[PDB]
Amino acid sequence: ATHEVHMLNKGESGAMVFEPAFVRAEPGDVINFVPTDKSHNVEAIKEILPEGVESFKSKINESYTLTVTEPGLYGVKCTPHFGMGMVGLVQVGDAPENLDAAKTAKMPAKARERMDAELAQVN
């Protein structure tokens, strides 16, 4: 299955956001990060990444494709807008092995606010 996440300056959900900010996926799924606005990218939050998964960091203003096969939680940030809370979360499979790391990972205050809102969607 494919998924689409827009990178926005000012969405309904706030300034500097991934929309949707939470994605439920299954192994083999493709997630496309789309620059609806300029100034954004996507980068893994190394504290919120499943076992095996290579770090990644996309170029500003471009699309990025993330293929997910390892189960668990994948935390993503926009590199220049992490401080402003531009973070997202992908859950692959059901109960995630790295749930607690996501709950406790150090990040800027607005990022932690948004990450907590995302963690509440964990199915």
Does position 86 interact with Cu ion (CB under 5 A)? The reply is: yes
Q: Is 3 annotated as a binding residue?
A: no
Nearest alpha-carbon partner for 21 in 120, 121, 118: 118
Q: How near is the Cβ of 77 to Cu ion at its closest, in Å?
A: 8
Q: Is 16 annotated as a binding residue?
A: no
Site string for Cu ion, 10-49 (x = CB under 5 A): ------------------------------x---------
Contacts of 24 (CB under 8 A, 6+ apart): 90, 91, 121, 123
Q: Is 78 annotated as a binding residue?
A: yes
Provide, for the chain, the percentages of residues in helix, strand and coil under a 3-state DSSP scheme, each rounded to the nearest 5: 15, 35, 50
Number of chain residues interacting with Cu ion (CB under 5 A): 4
Q: DSSP assignment, residue 113?
A: H
Could you list the residues that contact Cu ion (CB under 5 A)?
40, 78, 81, 86
